Amino acid sequence: NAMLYPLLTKTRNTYDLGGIWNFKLGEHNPNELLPSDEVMVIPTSFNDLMVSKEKRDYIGDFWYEKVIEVPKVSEDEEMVLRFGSVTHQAKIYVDGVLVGEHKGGFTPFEVLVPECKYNNEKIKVSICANNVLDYTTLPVGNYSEIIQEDGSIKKKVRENFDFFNYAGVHRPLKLMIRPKNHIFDITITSRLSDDLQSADLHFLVETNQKVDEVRISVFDEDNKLVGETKDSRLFLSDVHLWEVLNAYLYTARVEIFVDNQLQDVYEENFGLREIEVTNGQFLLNRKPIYFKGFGKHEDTFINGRGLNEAANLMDLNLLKDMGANSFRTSHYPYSEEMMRLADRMGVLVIDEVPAVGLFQNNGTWNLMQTKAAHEQAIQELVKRDKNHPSVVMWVVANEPASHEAGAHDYFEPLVKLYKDLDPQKRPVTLVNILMATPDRDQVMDLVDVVCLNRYYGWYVDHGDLTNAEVGIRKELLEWQDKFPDKPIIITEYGADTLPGLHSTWNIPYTEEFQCDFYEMSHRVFDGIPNLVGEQVWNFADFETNLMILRVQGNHKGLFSRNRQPKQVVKEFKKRWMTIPHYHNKKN
Amino acid sequence: NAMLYPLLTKTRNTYDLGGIWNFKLGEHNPNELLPSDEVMVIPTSFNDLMVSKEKRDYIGDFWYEKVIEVPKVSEDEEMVLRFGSVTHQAKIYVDGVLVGEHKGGFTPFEVLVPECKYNNEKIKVSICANNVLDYTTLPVGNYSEIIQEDGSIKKKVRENFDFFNYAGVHRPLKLMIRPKNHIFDITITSRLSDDLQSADLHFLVETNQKVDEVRISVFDEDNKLVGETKDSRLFLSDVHLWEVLNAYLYTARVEIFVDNQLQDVYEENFGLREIEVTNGQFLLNRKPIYFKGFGKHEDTFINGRGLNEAANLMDLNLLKDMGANSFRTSHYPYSEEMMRLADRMGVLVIDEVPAVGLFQNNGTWNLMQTKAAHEQAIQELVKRDKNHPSVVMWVVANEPASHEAGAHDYFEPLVKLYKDLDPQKRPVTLVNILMATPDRDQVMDLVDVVCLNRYYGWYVDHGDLTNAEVGIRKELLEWQDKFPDKPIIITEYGADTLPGLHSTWNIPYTEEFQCDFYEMSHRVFDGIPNLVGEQVWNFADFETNLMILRVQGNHKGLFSRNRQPKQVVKEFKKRWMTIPHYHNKKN
Ligand SMILES: [Mg+2]
Ligand SMILES: [Mg+2]
Ligand SMILES: [Mg+2]
Ligand SMILES: [Mg+2]
Numbered sequence A, B: 001n002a003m004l005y006p007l008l009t010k011t012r013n014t015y016d017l018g019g020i021w022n023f024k025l026g027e028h029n030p031n032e033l034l035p036s037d038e039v040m041v042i043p044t045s046f047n048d049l050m051v052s053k054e055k056r057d058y059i060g061d062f063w064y065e066k067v068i069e070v071p072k073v074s075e076d077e078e079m080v081l082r083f084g085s086v087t088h089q090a091k092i093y094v095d096g097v098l099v100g101e102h103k104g105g106f107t108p109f110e111v112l113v114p115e116c117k118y119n120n121e122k123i124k125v126s127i128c129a130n131n132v133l134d135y136t137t138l139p140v141g142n143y144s145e146i147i148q149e150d151g152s153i154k155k156k157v158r159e160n161f162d163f164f165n166y167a168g169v170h171r172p173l174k175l176m177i178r179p180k181n182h183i184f185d186i187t188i189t190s191r192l193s194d195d196l197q198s199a200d201l202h203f204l205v206e207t208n209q210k211v212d213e214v215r216i217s218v219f220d221e222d223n224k225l226v227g228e229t230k231d232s233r234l235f236l237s238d239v240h241l242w243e244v245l246n247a248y249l250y251t252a253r254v255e256i257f258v259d260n261q262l263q264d265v266y267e268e269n270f271g272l273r274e275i276e277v278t279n280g281q282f283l284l285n286r287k288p289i290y291f292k293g294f295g296k297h298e299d300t301f302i303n304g305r306g307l308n309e310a311a312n313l314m315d316l317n318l319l320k321d322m323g324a325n326s327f328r329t330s331h332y333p334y335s336e337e338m339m340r341l342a343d344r345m346g347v348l349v350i351d352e353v354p355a356v357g358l359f360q361n362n363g364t365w366n367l368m369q370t371k372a373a374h375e376q377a378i379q380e381l382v383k384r385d386k387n388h389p390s391v392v393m394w395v396v397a398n399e400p401a402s403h404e405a406g407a408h409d410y411f412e413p414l415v416k417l418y419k420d421l422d423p424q425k426r427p428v429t430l431v432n433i434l435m436a437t438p439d440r441d442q443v444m445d446l447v448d449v450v451c452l453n454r455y456y457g458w459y460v461d462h463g464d465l466t467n468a469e470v471g472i473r474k475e476l477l478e479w480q481d482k483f484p485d486k487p488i489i490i491t492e493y494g495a496d497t498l499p500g501l502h503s504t505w506n507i508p509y510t511e512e513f514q515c516d517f518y519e520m521s522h523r524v525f526d527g528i529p530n531l532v533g534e535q536v537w538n539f540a541d542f543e544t545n546l547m548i549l550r551v552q553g554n555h556k557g558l559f560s561r562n563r564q565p566k567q568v569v570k571e572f573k574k575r576w577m578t579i580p581h582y583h584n585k586k587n
Helices: A309-321 A336-345 A371-385 A407-421 A465-482 A511-525 A568-576 B309-322 B336-345 B371-385 B407-421 B465-482 B511-525 B568-576
Strands: A013-016 A019-025 A039-042 A061-069 A077-083 A089-094 A097-103 A109-112 A122-130 A141-147 A153-159 A173-179 A183-192 A199-207 A213-219 A225-229 A233-236 A250-258 A261-270 A275-278 A281-284 A291-295 A326-328 A348-352 A391-398 A428-432 A449-453 A488-492 A531-537 B013-016 B019-025 B039-042 B061-069 B077-083 B089-094 B097-103 B109-112 B122-130 B141-147 B153-159 B173-179 B183-192 B199-207 B213-219 B225-229 B233-236 B250-258 B261-270 B275-278 B281-284 B291-295 B326-328 B348-352 B391-398 B428-432 B449-453 B488-492 B531-536
Touching (some): A077 A097, A097 A109, A173 A261, A183 A261, A213 A233, A225 A233, A281 A531, A309 A336, A336 A348, A371 A407, A391 A407, A407 A428, A428 A488, A449 A465, A465 A488, A465 A511, A511 A531, B077 B089, B173 B261, B183 B261, B199 B213, B199 B250, B213 B233, B225 B233, B281 B531, B291 B488, B309 B336, B309 B568, B326 B531, B336 B348, B371 B391, B391 B407, B391 B449, B407 B428, B428 B488, B465 B511, B511 B531, B511 B568
Parallel strands (some): A291 A326, A291 A531, A326 A348, A391 A428, A449 A488, A488 A531, B291 B326, B326 B348, B348 B391, B391 B428, B428 B449, B449 B488, B488 B531
Antiparallel strands (some): A019 A039, A019 A061, A061 A122, A077 A109, A077 A173, A089 A097, A089 A122, A141 A153, A213 A225, A213 A250, A250 A261, B019 B039, B019 B061, B077 B109, B089 B097, B089 B122, B141 B153, B199 B233, B213 B250, B250 B261
16 A cells, blocks of 8 residues: 655655664563663664674564654645565554554555544654564574573574575655545556557556546656646657666656645656567567676665665666676565666666575475465565566566475466566566476476576586586576577576685685686576576675575675675676677577 | 604715606606606695696696716615605606505605616606595595596596695605615603603614614713613613603614624604503693694695695794694694604694594495505504604594494504504594594594594584583583593684684674684583693694685684684683693692
8 A cells, every 4th residue: 555655745745754763672562661771773774783692683573662743734634654664574553552564574564643643742653573584474484482491482583595684674764644535556557659659658546535637747857748648548759768778767747636626646757668578588678688787685784684775876886887787686675766776777677575485494385384475575566666667577486495396386376466466567587496407397387587596616516617517508408498488597696705815726715716607607608599697696795694604694796795896897897898788699 | 664764874874855856747657758848846735836726636646757866875885765755655766667665645655776776877766646545545535537528537536534635745855875784763662760750761773684782872952971771771860851841852872883883873862751541631741731732734835735844833833832732633644844843842742644534425334445554554653753752642533433333343453553553552542523422432432532523613503602502511521421531632623714704793704703612612621620631623724625615725723824813812822821731620
């Protein structure tokens, strides 16, 4: 119900509630006043702000509480609390009274403030956040409890994924004043003409009550009116297409009227671009695209998984400079701010739900109770991002046990849910793990694009690039042979590389070996006609939990965690600026 | 044989053949002249001198060759080539003729030059070294051959041990002119008086032919005569004991006479000190000793496993400064130069054969064909090092599969061999692996001292010092209970630590965690009465092969490979200078 990005309009007052909140790790009664003994920032992960390991490793309920002054609310208006996200679970309280809940730490949700408080001077907002992950949540965790022999139970979450379980309120919290009779949702679809000069637009505006008129004004990038409609349909000539690294955005100003007066107004951006997957190719605007980019992470020093718009722009500027053109929201939906940035900069985005960890240590599909959370995640993501021209593909899961029995039955309705909910019917994919090699895999028949995470030379044939090349070329041909019409994209491939580590003997973990690894990989990729994309793992080093294979987090980044480059960055820029975005390898 | 250290005496002309030799990786006919296209230094490992990975990873025969001018050799003299070691196997050639052979890369051997060449102007010495390791060699390797489909055989050695397979001529090669009738061995033993003020010296001088008189002169550290005998036995008064970090060495000048004229002369050093293991204690000069020190490696940059006397003295000076008192020759006998240095500096040495890798990647003892090499290793080591007062204990194996069936039958005669060969009958031990818990192990009953390699907090309970502390304390108490009168020494304990890695959250691989790991370890150790020693792994970072657990070699060193300290070095110096060398924890 809150998939529309929060705006300041003539009918919508949007206030930011970010800043210092009273904080507590542990139990709390929302009817009681949380003291200011401990405080916390919104938005940010709380973890790296804790000095001790004990508090940084906390699992369970943790509270945010602050008294907010009530703004003027008219009779025909309603006041809601719009969360960008709360990680992972949340129960929201107003004056000690439960007013909303949400499960899933990477999707936005709104909560209605009771009308009986609109004339009060202040309201106390309490946020009960929860970072527990188990077999019912996305992402998947291994939950356990141990008795401290002190009388209390201590919770632990052994992650089923390769990234640190950062938690907290990671995205902006807004106090929204909006009309009771308001615009609920906007869907924008287009059919491009045969000459790509015209477009048949369709605006599906959802309301909660009914209005006499639904007016839509369309403006270009010069803020010039180019179209008007009251019947949810509009034809437009002299269109400017949204292009890769050359974006063009229109704005649809939607106005609803009752008795000839404005009830609510909203502005939704959109881009004109065509997507089609056919004949082992990914077509953008009817031209073959070669994906060049990164698997990423919402990860930065200090803030952790918290929003940092400066980081987004810095990352995307580096992406553009290297000659790259895309990235994947691994392994969870990123902030709306990032998606809007990608729209504005013309960066292709592979959108992904938090479906990572669907893998036992078998009998995975008798153990995974994630169906409910998986369906909601797909519902929320599509509803939130369906209008983004940057979003070009959906991901049902990252490295699930797609070789075990019951896998095909699990994913078929989920792939279908993507196809049913997305009005653009964009391609959906499943990110494949090495254990699910062509013969054993039983799910890749459901998707439109084959996405592979392969580490020949790092995990398999470690430090053995000679035999790694034989292995990767062998399997890529197997995939291409099993699905002759499906395009292939490498979504993950890389090697842990610590800055400063050097050698003349192609030694793993050194900067030179990272260069050698990618050079070999690309030699193989360029020989596969159906391979239409390469996305490295990762853009930058990121935090993980404690595992012997992890040398203080993950170091497969091309850049360090401070966005400083490694040796391999210079090499990628040469390759990526040589290969055009529109690149046909069928010739 | 070649047990005696090469000396320059009036009867023995010893020349060093170190320098630049003509070199070749591959096949060679010793009847032919090796060109100077490739050269190599003696002594050093050849590996890190190769720029390419291909030549560095070479396995098989590799040749050293040089034309050497023959010096004056009289009628009663012979000329031999004395190799400190050749790693791992060697065939020696003089003018293309096979003249000597040795197996085992860490023990000395001599080879006779044919008498028919003593009046030649020059001789051509060819060394056919070989670095192949398998199930018949010490250390144990996993050998395999793969055809490159070019018609050639590519050999590969997969090491069964955690250190790089450095190879070459690592130790000085001497050209020795000695009398045909010479002293080939000298054994020095002593019985200390009850007041430790006197000593009964016994000498066993071995010659290859008959001699009329064996005269032995003993000189103190002031080079003053304190005794002389023709009966190979001598009583000494006002003796000065060899002490920990306070060494006193006597010199035995041994002269053999034939027909009233000097036949040969040699000088052998020795120290007066007593060793006894009893009641869960290690007694040196009848006082309880607490071992503080390191497991080491013959490893430096550039030289690899090659001898560096400067490195030996630098390391031993650091050892002394930190308050340490001992080290272990893991996992192979070190250079004679190191042993003699330890004698001079009063450093305790745990002497060790290359019996590492006796563990199948169960049924280890149905696959290990190492019996012959193991017997030779023990024979060579004892014969070479028995006169060193620094040597206080022998190691029969490092981390073998001592929990599997057949282990006891394998080690029982090998432990016996140490006792039979060593005239001092020093304690022998077995370095135990973590898989062989007190219940599973079936070999520790044979040894005098229990040596344990434990990594609670690193390998088991990784980054969980809380649960690690419980685990290590639990097992240590089990060992103490199973063997109530056997002393316990921790011979390996540490955590990989890369210089520059930092955190406030006790993160593995950081310098802080290394401190935390050792702090926890010591808290446990101090509560175990039978634990009489702690030797960390490792003294310094060292090179290993390629595998995902190795971040460019092993980083468990207290010092970096360049001998620069890590954060923990300061903490160890505090502890080791508080705990005396003579420290009784029975009280
Ligand atoms: Mg910020
Ligand atoms: Mg690969
Ligand atoms: Mg331990
Ligand atoms: Mg103590």
